[model samples]
Target chain A: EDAGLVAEAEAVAAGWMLDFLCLSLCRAFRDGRSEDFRRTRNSAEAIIHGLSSLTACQLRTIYICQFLTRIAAGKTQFDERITPLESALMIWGSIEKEHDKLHEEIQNLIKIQAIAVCMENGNFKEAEEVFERIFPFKSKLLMIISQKDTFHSFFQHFSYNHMMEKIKSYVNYVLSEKSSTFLMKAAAKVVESKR
Target chain B: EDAGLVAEAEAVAAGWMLDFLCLSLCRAFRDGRSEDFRRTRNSAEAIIHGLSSLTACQLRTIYICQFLTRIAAGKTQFDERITPLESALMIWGSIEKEHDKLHEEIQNLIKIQAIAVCMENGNFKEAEEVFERIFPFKSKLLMIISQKDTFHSFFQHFSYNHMMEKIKSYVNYVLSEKSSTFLMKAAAKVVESKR
Candidate 1:
């Protein structure tokens, strides 16, 4: 009887926690504020701790994956408390056995985020390696980076003379056959500008 | 003929400038980034200088009024270029005719923002005065301040002993009959906590 009651309590906590996570994540996505990002991360950690069932854990894992994608896509700012790729790895560990397809997609998301972080940190060689690994996901990657405002934030973060030529060349190569002429034009102008 | 051409060029510039202002304001509202707020303010000033027709000037005035409302509502950050109240006043100076109805709403918004700023700056007396001025808009203001995450940011900015009592009294007074039990509970805990 005691065990059953404990299980009921745990289920209740999981439900409440998931609601908090969803609300916080929506705020983060809508405002793209650092404060909101911190709230989302906090709620994510809360859900991780309070997860009662495998399904609940899986749900949390997917939400975390979406959060990482937003950060990787530069739709939101990065939170210092959790690195995008690191969080992806943790999520992967939690759900890898039962959810094979999700596991693979998350791995790809991790690689994409790794490339973005490497570019931001001025590690072009490492970024290039990760970029090549995700070549199969080129179209998905292009779609992520092609968002106008997202691309602006990403470009602004890494806009330096030493990296400009290589970054532009990489974008040019990846998006050469893509249909977004506006992105292509934007990339050209971004690379041409001086700080 | 030259003067007419110059007026035409100025009108065209005003239209283009207004588009830039709207784009920048959307970005600021969507992201709450300091950079976007700066861009919006810069574009607002650009339009003020480039406007030719009185109609164009009036249009800019209304848009600027809307911008001030967003800032005052805490939907966007206040730019360093102008305060929420100051920008509303500038817009008011430009359009005092057909926009009379908007003027009263902007004034009330300004009072609400003034209270928030005064609380942040630890000017409880001033905050109290402004708080009283917006009594008719109490429910709207409570909804704004009662948002959990929004209230968290608001509390963090003014978590000092000197303002605790005044802040609590104001929230308690405004939300006394409101159905937001969560807000009331949160407000109690926030005020009870030590700096």
Candidate 2:
């Protein structure tokens, strides 16, 4: 009991410190001070490393990877393709399963956001790929929405976002649009930017 | 010209709101409220999807992916190995390069972290794999440090952390340790956990 309390408390203290550093990291990012962000991260990682805390280490891993992913969007960032993502999968392999919900929501958000980013850059090709990943099973209707005049065009014109907003009133069209919260938000963002 | 100023100002407003939502997202996470976090994220994504803002989307991508990565650590997260990482690499392909440094640091941090997390789980095989990626060029010293008795044992005992602290005083050992900051942080984390 003695060691258990001692260990848990220390570990909790470390997690709190990590949270402090993470907020700073985000601020550094908001301020556009990439170097400061990293320096802070170095300290964070050192603390994270200092423990055999799987939770802490895992938390850091996610933080770093997300950071890396954003950096890529900026110039972008890696890999033979297989290695880094595979490494993530492996890491996930050992992670305790009690915390799966947030990750699912987060990834869903990232993948959808990737679609919008791709569309922002005026690249439908990759955005399509990301969009495809979200609904891998694909329905005949998914293919219909993805047709050149539909999904790709949405990025280029507000008319589609507006039109789709109205278009979804039709039940069949609703299936296509409601098939994705991804589509709803993608449509919302694209049209709102024009306003 | 009128549109330019108005557009820029509006974009600024969007970015600021994003920052606000982001803080909420982090706090939701810290509070361990997964569902609330997602609800906030849903709002965040809806706002995110409303625009064709590459920067905003990219920023969110990093945030979400990191969140996803952490959730995995708690229980674990996917891919045939090739696709998701490859997708990230592709995203990197289109990103502007002005922000490369942090991404590099973040990936290095994540990779090093995978090593620590792997070790935490008592799976040295994977940890060694992650370690190898950090020093991909490979050297006699790296190989020697990596040998069974060396790296794996570090996690299980404090003696190695302390011994290595003293051991590095020898020039050769310093080379082995200094070859990568990865080793330094990883060692620090492992030893500190015991203390």
Per-model C-alpha lDDT, please?
Answer: 0.43, 0.41
Chain A superposition TM-score per model: 0.43, 0.39
**Candidate 2 lDDT by residue in tens digits, A1-195:** 243443344344344334444443443444445665555455454445434645654564445434433432322325333222233333334444434654454333343344555555666575566556554334542453455333444334433233223212322332232223321233334556767
TM-score of 1: 0.27
DockQ of all models, two decimals each? 0.02, 0.02
Tens digits of per-residue lDDT for model 2, B9-103: 33443443344345444444544556555554654554453235557445644454344324323223253332232233334334444346544
lDDT of 1 by residue, B31-81 (tens): 445654554454355344434455754564445436444443432244444
- Colliding pairs, model 1: none
Cα lDDT for residue B118, model 2? 50
Please identify model 2 stretches exceeding 4 Å from their true place.
A1-195, B1-17, B29-43, B55-109, B122-125, B136-195
